[PDB]
Write a protein that binds this DNA or RNA. Structure first.
Ligand SMILES: [Zn+2]
Ligand SMILES: [Zn+2]
Lengths: 114, 115
DNA sequence: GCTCTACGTCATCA
DNA sequence: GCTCTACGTCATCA
């Protein structure tokens, strides 16, 4: 049978990482490696990775899971991205983590400015 | 025999102001009164009246005529609004002609700030 | 640790 | 004297 690609043991994949994000990763290894598998909100993606609404709303660029807004089911749907995908785009976009941290550096000066 | 609201004489209305802007006015009168009947582009509307893309897109708030973009037919469509509508909305929004003039005054001063 | 949008300008590109 | 979008923050509101 096919095996979790992190641990090489488990045969029962995490239903969400599997069905939605297309990753053969079991549940236990999703927890044990949040640097890869942690589901972040759309706002977490904007602020941590400086991704813009036009790239987060590309259907053809990220998988997503959509959830009712925990604040109210009449507010816009919660969207959830798997961290390795957004990270992997964000590292192209800004040229690696070195380059990412420099844009963090750049905007915080902007606040001292204001 | 319905008559032109401007001249009170012609029976034949300008087909565009009639069909599209729902105005009972003749070609000759639209011409003589640009202050009421001139068709303005979407971009003329933003420059001159400080209306915004969200207002000008409201299907339920202005009539519009659409023509192919005169620069290229591959480009986004030209959108044409009638000056009585536009000016009317903008006067409500900016508190009259005087208020629209103040707003003008304010955005010139945004450029004197950015030298 | 929720999201959309609109402000605001302008530059592109279309 | 053509149009949209994006790039900016946020705030507000949904
Ligand atoms: Zn595993
Ligand atoms: Zn007439």
């Amino acid at each position: 049978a096919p095996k979790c690609i992190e641990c090489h043991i488990n045969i029962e994949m995490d239903p969400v990482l599997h069905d939605v994000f297309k990753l053969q990763v079991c549940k236990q290894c999703s927890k044990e490696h949040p640097e890869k598998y942690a589901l972040l909100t759309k706002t977490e993606c904007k602020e941590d990775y400086f991704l813009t609404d036009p790239e987060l709303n590309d259907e053809d660029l990220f998988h997503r899971l959509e959830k009712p807004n925990p604040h109210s089911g009449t507010f816009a749907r919660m969207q959830l991205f798997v961290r390795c995908e957004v990270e992997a785009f964000a590292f192209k976009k800004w040229g690696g983590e070195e380059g990412l941290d420099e844009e963090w550096q750049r905007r915080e000066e902007g606040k001292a400015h204001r």
